[PDB]
Structures are given as C-alpha cells and as structure tokens.
Amino acid sequence: PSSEQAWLEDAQVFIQKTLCPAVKEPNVQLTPLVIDCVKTVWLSQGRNQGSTLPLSYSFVSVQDLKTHQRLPCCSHLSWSSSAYQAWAQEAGPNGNPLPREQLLLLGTLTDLSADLEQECRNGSLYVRDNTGVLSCELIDLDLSWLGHLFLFPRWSYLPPARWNSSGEGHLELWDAPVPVFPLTISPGPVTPIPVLYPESASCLLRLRNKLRGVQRNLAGSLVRLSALVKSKQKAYFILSLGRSHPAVTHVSIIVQVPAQLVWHRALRPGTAYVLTELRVSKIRGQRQHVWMTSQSSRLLLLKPECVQEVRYSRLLSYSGAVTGVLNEPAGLYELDGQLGLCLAYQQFRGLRRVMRPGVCLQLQDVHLLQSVGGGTRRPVLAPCLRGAVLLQSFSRQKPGAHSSRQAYGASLYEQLVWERQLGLPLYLWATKALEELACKLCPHVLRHHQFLQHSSPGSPSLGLQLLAPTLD
Amino acid sequence: ASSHKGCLQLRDQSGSLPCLLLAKHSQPLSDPRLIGCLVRAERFQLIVERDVRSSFPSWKELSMPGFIQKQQARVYVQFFLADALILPVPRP
C-alpha cells in the first residue's frame, strides 16, 4: 500500500521541519531512529492489526494541536476498540469518557517556562518543541529526564472552557515517557558519601554555637512536605527529614533554589533520600535554625551501597477519590460522595486545571472538622499550609459545560480567604449566601461576572457590600 | 415605580411586593432619586389583611366548615428608611 509510504514520507518531512534542532546540523539518522522507536512501541503490546506500522496515527505539532483542537481529547498508542472500551468502563459507565484520537507528539520535558526562561521559574512541568511550549503534569519524574526528547504514548489535552479564561490549555500524561534515543546517562558518585542521620542532625541543631558556616550532608526519611508557598518573587517549600518508626524527631530543610523547585514534583513521602552540601540559615522571628539548600547541591536517594554512617480538629492523613463538585471557584469538593473537601486555605491556583471528578488524591496532614453548623452537616477536610495535596491518578470523564456560564467568581473567594481572614464556617455561609443572591438577582439585574467581580479600588463588588453588615 | 398605577414596589426576578416607605421619624418619602436603586432592610414589617364574606347563622355554628364563601388576602411591607441601606446599581 503506497499510503504507508506516503505517510512515512510525511513523517520524515515533519521531522525535518519541526523536529530538527536548529543548533546542530540535522543528523539524517534521526528519522530512522524515530521510526524504529515508534515501531518498537507499536509492536511491544502485541496487538497490531497485521500492520507493522500504525497507519491510523498521524503526526501533529504542538502549535497545530493548539490552533486546531477545540474539544477535550485523549490520544493513546495501540488502543483498539477493546482497550478503549475497557478504559471507558474503568472511567465509570455513568460518566462519558473523553473522545479517542490517533495522533503523535514529540517534545522535550523541561521546567523552563518560555523564552523568558528565568522570569517565570515557578517549577511547572513544560513540554517544549520548535512550535511552542505546552504544560504537562506527571505523577512521578526523574531529574535525568529533563532536557531530552521523549516519545509520548499516552496523553490527554484539555482546552479552556470559558472565553474569559486566559489559560491556553494543558496536557496530562498517564504512562512513563518513552525515550526516543538512548540518553547519555552519566555515572553517579563512585566514592562513598557518608551522611548524617536525623538523630545526629538534631544533636547538631542542639549545639547552637557549632553551626557557623559549616557545609555538611544530611539524610533521612521524608516525613512531611509543605505546600508551594508563592510570594511576589520568591517561592520556597519545606521538606521534613526524620527517621520513621518512630517518626518522632525530624529535621526541617527549606528549598529555595529556583532551578531546583521542580523537586516539589519529585519527592514522595516515606522514601529516604540523601541531601548534600547543606548550610545553616537563619529565619527572622524564629529562634531555631533551618538548613539551607546550596546552589551546588544535588538530590540523592538513600543507597546503602555507598551511604555509610470551641472545639478542635484531629489531624490525620486520608486517601480517596473525587466524585462530586459543589463549588468550583471556592474550592469545595465532595470525597467519595460522603465527605466534603475544602481547598480554600491553600493556594490551589494550579489545581483547578487538572483535578476534576474521577481523580484520586493522597492528602497529608489534613484537619477533620465536625458539627460545623450554619446550614452544612457533613464533615469537611480542610488542609492547611503545613500539608500538601498529592495527585495520584488523572480523570477520564469530560469536564462539565455549565461551568462555562456560572462558575468564574474566583477572585472574590480568595480575597475573602486571604484579605479578611475569615473562618471556615463563615466562609461556607458566605458562599451559600452568595449563591442565593446570585440566584435572586442575576442575570437580568446584573451579569454573573459583574456581581462577583474582584473588589479592586474604584469598583467594589456588590456581593461583598451586601455581605458586609453580617460579616463585620 | 409603576407607570400604570403610581404605586411603589420592590421587585426582583422572582416577583413583586407592594411597599410603603417612610423617612425618619414621621416624614414622607420625598426624594425621587431612589428610583432604580437597591434597598436592603433588616427590620421590616409584613402586613396581611383578611377579607371574609361569612354567613354564620349564630354562635353555635362558629366552628362549622361550610359557612365561608369568599376569602382574600393582601400583603405589603412597611419599614423606615433610616434602618435600611441604599446601594446604587452600577449600570454598564
């Protein structure tokens, strides 16, 4: 069939155009390597319909995907009718699974934001090629994977819903990214690296006069991870290292390096790691001292081969899945249809894009509240800045469509959370009253976005003004 | 303010409700700049008037159920304007 040869030639031209690097001369051997990798991935599953090549798949660039695709879509390699139906049944028969596509993508996994490389060092995962850069989210990652070409066998693209949203879109990857070509893997540190266990680190911290500019190495088991606090120009998150069983004593470490902010997506609880070249830092207003990550510091794991020596809330950790959505802008969600979850007191600006019904979440250091009152009865879990939310599995159901009309009111809710510093029951009652007022007045008297507008100077929101007499 | 009967009303998307507004301490509502504004009241009175056309024979049959023919109601709201809050509507 000449169609196969024509498609192969089109793939060759696509590689020549939008995949050949502009720094080095294009080595002609890249196309046979890409074709061989594609064929190997195609044949590994052993479910090919008698053709050594996937005739149904066509290459599409990142810019082409952005400019052409207008609906959510998930494309996977070697997904016949049986596999797609199994995936849909796994997604839940009640929900409608995302439509299937047959396309090919190639890009580089980079933490760099855009041409303004250091101006937006937020630690996000970005897929960049010649056409442009598009965001991605991974469950787990390895530091060696960045800066190299990777072939994507499974992905899901979600475009923005409402026309008033400036977000271009995002991508979600399910399986591990297959390397297109053998990456030059550098050997690790051959010489043994002695470290300090959490007991020794705590003993050193007990010696306040013996921490004057000493660059040492510390290691231990990851106990607690903090949220990614965002400031005007500085982002820092704190990881706790301490020996578990009993996990009584732990040593705090603050990560502030911009290029190493991607470690927020890498570290996982329970596993013990090794941190090298850590100095002493002083925090204003805190008597204790917390170790500082240095510029020439590397993230390592604990490898025994070379590492020689009025009511209250009950804190706990929970794991579950998201089933229902109560109030998207206010960060109110239902867990397993039995428990409520409130993300208001964290900074979940980047959680709305990915997390949706059909997603399993692993929470750490959350607070359980009961008998809240004020119109609500179910208990609500409200994580604070101490803990963090770890995504486990992506969702497969399509996002809702009604949210494109009556959902965007986010700025007022976050302003209520942070500026006025309201309590949780007051926040819930405020959300309920705002919904009632919106139903009563909007849309003839006032448009939905006008009523819940940001309370900037010179144009205060009517909802906040109406709620002020009770809130004060 | 209705343009067919000249009676003040409070209206939302749900419906309408006749109202009687007064200024502070026994003074009539005089300013006509309140047309189209938003009125919020925390202390107000709900008044219902009942009209019945009964045909009861005597005191013995007061509790019998077949001696009432016509029933009607009339609901409106009275409240002072000093205890309320007026907010302009930001037209685009």
Curated annotation (Swiss-Prot), chain B:
Highest rank taxon of the organism: Eukaryota
Compartment annotation: Nucleus; Chromosome, Telomere
Range of residues in the leader sequence: none
Disease: Cerebroretinal microangiopathy with calcifications and cysts 1: An autosomal recessive pleiomorphic disorder characterized primarily by intracranial calcifications, leukodystrophy, and brain cysts, resulting in spasticity, ataxia, dystonia, seizures, and cognitive decline. Patients also have retinal telangiectasia and exudates (Coats disease) as well as extraneurologic manifestations, including osteopenia with poor bone healing and a high risk of gastrointestinal bleeding and portal hypertension caused by vasculature ectasias in the stomach, small intestine, and liver.
Purpose: Component of the CST complex proposed to act as a specialized replication factor promoting DNA replication under conditions of replication stress or natural replication barriers such as the telomere duplex. The CST complex binds single-stranded DNA with high affinity in a sequence-independent manner, while isolated subunits bind DNA with low affinity by themselves. Initially the CST complex has been proposed to protect telomeres from DNA degradation. However, the CST complex has been shown to be involved in several aspects of telomere replication.
Protein family (similarity comment): Belongs to the CTC1 family.
Subunit structure: Component of the CST complex, composed of TEN1/C17orf106, CTC1/C17orf68 and STN1; in the complex interacts directly with STN1. Interacts with ACD and POT1.
Name of protein: CST complex subunit CTC1
Origin organism lineage: Eukaryota, Metazoa, Chordata, Craniata, Vertebrata
